[PDB]
Amino acid sequence: RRTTNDGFHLLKAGGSCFALISGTANQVKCYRFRVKKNHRHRYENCTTTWFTVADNGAERQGQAQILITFGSPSQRQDFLKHVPLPPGMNISGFTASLDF
Amino acid sequence: RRTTNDGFHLLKAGGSCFALISGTANQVKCYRFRVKKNHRHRYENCTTTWFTVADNGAERQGQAQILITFGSPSQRQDFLKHVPLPPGMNISGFTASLDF
User: Which residues of B touch A12 (CB under 8 A)?
Assistant: First the structure.
């Protein structure tokens, strides 16, 4: 084309909300395995499982921090109908504003 | 207490920007190894090296996707002075808004 192409960042388009789900490892492992069958239509793209480090204590998050990117708020809202959330995890939907 | 603490998501406070650095893997590996000494004050918390999947193409990102959360905009700006960015990689500052 030009090439004035990509830095490989996918959150660019202005309605790329990320559900960050910091569920407990075993439960997230079960969750993703269970979800992928019927509840593929609950996301477009997602990560693997990952972990975040802390600063001062010798700590990580032991919890598997998955990141889920949907355009549709219908995916977020029809969530509880089609795949209701288990307790033990919490979900947090962050709306991504590209700043540059 | 509660203990109504975390869901373990570190983007909560209204000034947690994420630099999402999708450098080539070897470059990301060299970047951090070089950076960590003097350019520790380029970040507060940051990730490991993660990767994204593609949807319909049988690919991932081969490039390594680190995510960097600093409070300061001085962090992003005194960046180019103290550690000027190499070419070949890209960075993106996504300023994160919690929706819920």
Answer: 92
A3 touches B at CB < 8 Å: no
Q: How many domains is chain B built from?
A: 1
Partner B contacted by A64 (CB < 8 A): no
Q: Which amino acid is at B99?
A: D
Give the strand pairing for A91-98 and B17-23.
Answer: unpaired
Identify the experimental approach.
NMR
CATH of the domain at B20: 3.30.70.330
Record: contact A17-B63, CB cut-off 8 A: no
What tokens does B52 get? 């994204």
Residue A61's contacts (CB-CB under 8 Å, 6 or more residues apart) are A22, A51, A52, A54, B8
* CB B94, CB B79: distance < 8 Å: no
Reference B82, options B39, B19, B46, B44; nearest CA is B39
